[PDB]
């Protein structure tokens, strides 16, 4: 149906916009702290602590399968990246502090993406 096609074109355009968001967020992480999964071969106890690991590469795979149906879904995964880091790492560490900073700088990017998704429909 043409209705189905139109929904598919909307999902594609949302995907395009979330790609630009994901690239922008990732530029706020030049050290690449959040780029890849934590390796269970080097924080071997990680999964006893953190139930839903998340990272930018994992988000990118989901994005490329058009796996985010709305901005809220994409935001939830970004929030897992930050929140997991702030739980596993202590307040005094480079990792916790990098998560605070990414959250702060990511706020700006996400605030405008919400306006664009609402405005474009
Ligand atoms: Na903690």
Swiss-Prot record:
<comment type="function">
    <text>Scaffold subunit of various histone acetyltransferase (HAT) complexes, such as the MOZ/MORF and HBO1 complexes, that acts as a regulator of hematopoiesis. Plays a key role in HBO1 complex by directing KAT7/HBO1 specificity towards histone H3 'Lys-14' acetylation (H3K14ac), thereby promoting erythroid differentiation.</text>
</comment>
<protein>
    <recommendedName>
        <fullName>Bromodomain-containing protein 1</fullName>
    </recommendedName>
</protein>
<feature type="domain" description="Bromo">
    <location>
        <begin position="9"/>
        <end position="113"/>
    </location>
</feature>
<comment type="subunit">
    <text>Component of some HBO1 complex composed of KAT7/HBO1, MEAF6, ING4 and BRD1/BRPF2. Component of the MOZ/MORF complex composed at least of ING5, KAT6A, KAT6B, MEAF6 and one of BRPF1, BRD1/BRPF2 and BRPF3. Interacts (via PHD-type zinc finger domain) with unmodified histone H3. Interacts (via PWWP domain) with dimethylated and trimethylated 'Lys-79' on histone H3.</text>
</comment>
<feature type="cross-link" description="Glycyl lysine isopeptide (Lys-Gly) (interchain with G-Cter in SUMO2)">
    <location>
        <position position="41"/>
    </location>
</feature>
């Amino acid at each position: 149906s043409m209705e189905q096609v139109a929904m598919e074109l909307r999902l594609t355009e949302l995907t395009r916009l979330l790609r630009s968001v994901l690239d922008q967020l990732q530029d706020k992480d030049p050290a690449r702290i959040f780029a890849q999964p934590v390796s269970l071969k080097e924080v071997p106890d990680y999964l006893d602590h953190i139930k839903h690991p998340m990272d930018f590469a994992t988000m990118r795979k989901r994005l490329e399968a058009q796996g985010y149906k709305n901005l809220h879904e994409f935001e939830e995964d970004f929030d897992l990246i930050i929140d997991n880091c702030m739980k596993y790492n202590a307040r005094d560490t480079v990792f916790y502090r990098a998560a605070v900073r990414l959250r702060d700088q990511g706020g700006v990017v996400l605030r405008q993406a919400r306006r664009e998704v609402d405005s474009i429909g």
